[PDB]
Amino acid sequence: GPMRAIDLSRERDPNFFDNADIPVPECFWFMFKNNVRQDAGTCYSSWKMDKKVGPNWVHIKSDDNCNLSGDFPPGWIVLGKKRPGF
Amino acid sequence: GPMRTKIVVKVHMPCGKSRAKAMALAASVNGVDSVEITGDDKDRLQVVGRGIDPVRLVALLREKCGLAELLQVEEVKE
Ligand SMILES: [Cl-]
Ligand SMILES: [Cl-]
């Protein structure tokens, strides 16, 4: 092993701040280039965002469990997971 | 109510003085309701507000801080 080179259950939380005046976002996202973490943050579940992913600007949809869908440039990926308490 | 949006911008702002200038700029932009600093290196601005043009915000920051990159634009789900 390991079977997975990217395992979100082993990733430290992003560096983020939940703004007091808007709902708490349900997901953590994590962005990788060749399996090396580059950035991480939060996004809503059952929703969407526009995100910089390497040289590209990408529309990313999230499902109810923070699975993310988008057209990422080679070597790059953005993966989601639900935060504890949701 | 009206659609709000969260914008995360990476800004060149290596120290506190530069952060204050970026925060003051962002705070003055029409439709900004809040501005916070985030990131391990304290080089992201997280802005929340109403009807902001993210590209204009970045343009204004770039011509004040020398570098600014849009990272995330997300409507507030509410
Ligand atoms: Cl929040
Ligand atoms: Cl940009």
Numbering used by the authors:
A (entry chain B): 28 to 113
B (entry chain A): 994 to 1071
Paper excerpt:
Nucleotide-binding leucine-rich repeat (NLRs) receptors are intracellular immune proteins that trigger robust defense responses upon recognition of pathogen virulence proteins (effectors) delivered into the host during infection. One such mechanism is the use of integrated domains, which function as effector baits embedded within the canonical NLR architecture. The RGA5/RGA4 and Pik pairs harbor an integrated heavy metal-associated (HMA) domain in their sensor NLRs RGA5 and Pik-1 that directly bind and recognize MAX (Magnaporthe oryzae avirulence and ToxB like) effectors. The HMA domains of Pik-1 and RGA5 use spatially distinct protein interfaces for effector recognition.
Using a host target of AVR-Pik, O. sativa heavy metal-associated isoprenylated plant protein 19 (OsHIPP19) as a structural template for APB, we generated an RGA5 variant, termed the APB mutant. The APB mutant contains the point mutations Glu1033Asp, Val1039Gln, Met1065Gln, Leu1068Glu, Glu1070Lys, and Lys1071Glu that localize to a potential APB interface of the RGA5 HMA. As the effector recognition interfaces of RGA5 and Pikm-1 HMA domains are different, we determined a crystal structure of the complex between the APB mutant and AVR-PikF, to validate our structural modeling of the RGA5 HMA and confirm we had engineered an AVR-Pik/Pik-HMA-like interface into RGA5 HMA. Following this, we used a coexpression approach to purify an APB/AVR-PikF complex, which was used to obtain crystals via sparse matrix screening. X-ray diffraction data were collected at the Diamond Light Source, Oxford, resulting in a 1.3-Å data set (see details of crystallization and structure solution in Materials and methods). The APB/AVR-PikF complex shares the same interface as Pikm-1 HMA/AVR-PikD and OsHIPP19/AVR-PikF complexes. Structural alignment of these complexes results in an RMSD of 0.51 and 0.39 Å, respectively. As predicted, each of the 6 mutations in the RGA5 HMA generated to facilitate APB is located at the effector interface. Therefore, to quantify the affinity between the APB and AVR-Pik effectors, we used single-cycle kinetics with a long dissociation phase, which allowed us to calculate a KD of 0.31, 2.95, and 16.50 nM for AVR-PikD, AVR-PikC, and AVR-PikF respectively.
